[PDB]
Every structure is written in structure tokens, then in C-alpha cells.
Amino acid sequence: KCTSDQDEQFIPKGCSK
């Protein structure tokens, strides 16, 4: 998932790598 809560200046090494 890109946004976990409201995470706009962080997406993971998992959503779009």
C-alpha cells in the first residue's frame, strides 16, 4: 500500500519500487 495513513512524502519499498 502507498498511503498507510496519510503518508504523502513516504511510500514503502513495496508499493511502487
Tab-separated table of C-alpha atoms in Angstrom:
chain	number	residue	atom	x	y	z
A	1	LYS	CA	0.000	0.000	0.000
A	2	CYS	CA	1.289	3.521	-1.000
A	3	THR	CA	-0.555	5.591	1.703
A	4	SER	CA	-0.686	3.633	5.043
A	5	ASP	CA	-2.478	6.518	6.930
A	6	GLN	CA	-1.855	9.978	5.285
A	7	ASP	CA	1.756	9.163	4.096
A	8	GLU	CA	2.249	11.538	1.066
A	9	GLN	CA	6.093	12.236	1.355
A	10	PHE	CA	6.635	8.430	2.091
A	11	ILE	CA	5.545	5.394	0.084
A	12	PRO	CA	7.312	1.977	1.016
A	13	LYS	CA	9.833	-0.356	-0.705
A	14	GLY	CA	6.711	-2.431	-1.511
A	15	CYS	CA	4.049	-0.337	-3.386
A	16	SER	CA	5.893	1.120	-6.475
A	17	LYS	CA	9.650	0.153	-6.290
